[model samples]
Target: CLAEGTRIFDPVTGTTHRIEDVVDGRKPIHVVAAAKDGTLHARPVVSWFDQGTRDVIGLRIAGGAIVWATPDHKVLTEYGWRAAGELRKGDRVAVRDVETGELRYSVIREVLPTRRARTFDLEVEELHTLVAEGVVVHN
Candidate 1:
């Protein structure tokens, strides 16, 4: 379940909508690229009602976290947060280590680009080890 104002984007058509609208059982107007690492990254849609805003929100197991947020698509594009261009092979990225609470970075070792989606082979050996540490942060 997502909050009321949560937004989601469909990479297939490059459109975004509110979580309320989507979870209301509305089908995605487009096909979005959901990373193989189990992360859904999307750009917020700007419209008259929204006063033209563009933001990057990452949907993960931890719930929706703001990855990169901006006022307009131009800023999102300039900051390389918008879902555009080819997700070519060998792209480096970072993520939070759920177990160790440290930032874990990785590189895309492989890419399986499909019309509707793409898969990335992330190299996170060290991160994996840290994640396996099972450091309990809280009760």
Candidate 2:
């Protein structure tokens, strides 16, 4: 469950609200909302999920699409995690090595707004290497 003061966007109201209330069985209630994009990013104190096997009510409550990723995301780079805004093309990153099942050095080939999730305002970082005969991955 969320805690007091956690931020949430009420898309239906087009406003941001702080989680004034929280509990295992209830959806949080908001007070007010806003950010540069008219919403705030959030991660579940406990991630959102479905209620269950039968009728499938809110397993608690399944919230928004990616309104659910960790609020602060970083790029896994050679220097460790870097803020998403700081990565650049040509930078070296630590990528999940598919072949050996371990992290391996990879090259950042691009960084851009996630076109497919623009409504969610997520950014995408692209990394690559020849490990898979020219393998490219996105984060």
lDDT of 2 at 59: 8
- On the 0 to 100 scale, the lDDT of residue 64 in model 1 is 26
**Tens-digit lDDT track for model 1 on 98-130?**
344344444434432222111111121222111
Flag regions of model 1 displaced more than 4 Å: 1-22, 25-84, 115-139
Model 1 TM-score on a 0 to 1 scale = 0.26
Poorest 10 consecutive residues of model 1 by lDDT?
130-139
Best TM-score among the predictions, by candidate number: 2
Q: Each prediction's Cα lDDT score? A: 0.28, 0.30
**Clash totals for all candidate models:** 2, 5
Model 1 lDDT, full chain set: 0.28
Q: Which stretches of candidate 2 lie over 4 Å from their true place?
A: 1-46, 49-72, 114-139
lDDT of 2: 0.30
RMSD of each predicted structure? 15.8, 17.6
